[PDB]
Amino acid sequence: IVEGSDAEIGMSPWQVMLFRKSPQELLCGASLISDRWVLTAAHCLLYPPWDKNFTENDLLVRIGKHSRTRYERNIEKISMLEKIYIHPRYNWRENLDRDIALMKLKKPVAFSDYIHPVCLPDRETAASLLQAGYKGRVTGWGNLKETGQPSVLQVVNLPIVERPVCKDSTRIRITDNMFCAGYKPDEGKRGDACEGDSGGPFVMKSPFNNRWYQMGIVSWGEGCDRDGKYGFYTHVFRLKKWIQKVIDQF
């Protein structure tokens, strides 16, 4: 996260860390959506142009973490992957369309003050909150600068940006399965997700029921926190049918 701030303890208890077994490193962010399902970006597990194709046994999920590098004894829980599920139409060839994936855990994770699932939006949460101007919150342990690393979880609040402005910021083809978020140059305020924040959640707090909903997944960008550029996010509600299908079936 660039130009964000340290997370508060228990501020994002759905936050998940995708952690590579060997070499032991940060793979990506992710989100806890129930006691056995974790949501992330497909590009975190599959990206052929970069020779990325991870299977279940190549990683673990670390839940309830704050410190990036520390093994947080008696706080985090580390869980093994039973099965990975990537959107069958995930378009890694061109624009990361449908950049989404589910991970089923071997065993349920126990909720705690530090471990708690985020809600997924329904059609009305989406219509109500996914509006240009409205801010979301992005969290992760990624790069503090486009080109260093944080000691603890970073957080940044960012406004959702108008669709034409998103489209006019990039040569990449944008779809209905994406939205972009970030401050304009003229607004002065800064911030962005960056490398390593991939797969982490973009959340909004409903003013109606005071619950946190995950509206986006950190998907892509061109550089980090650059003027005139915006972070792009997987539109979670637009891919809800697939989420429920996977979870209903498996």
Binding site: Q24, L60, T69, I78, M80
Partner: peptide, 10 residues
């Protein structure tokens, strides 16, 4: 640079 996690976790 990352602290080792319990061997049980592998």
């Amino acid at each position: 640079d990352f602290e080792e996690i319990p061997e049980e976790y592998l």
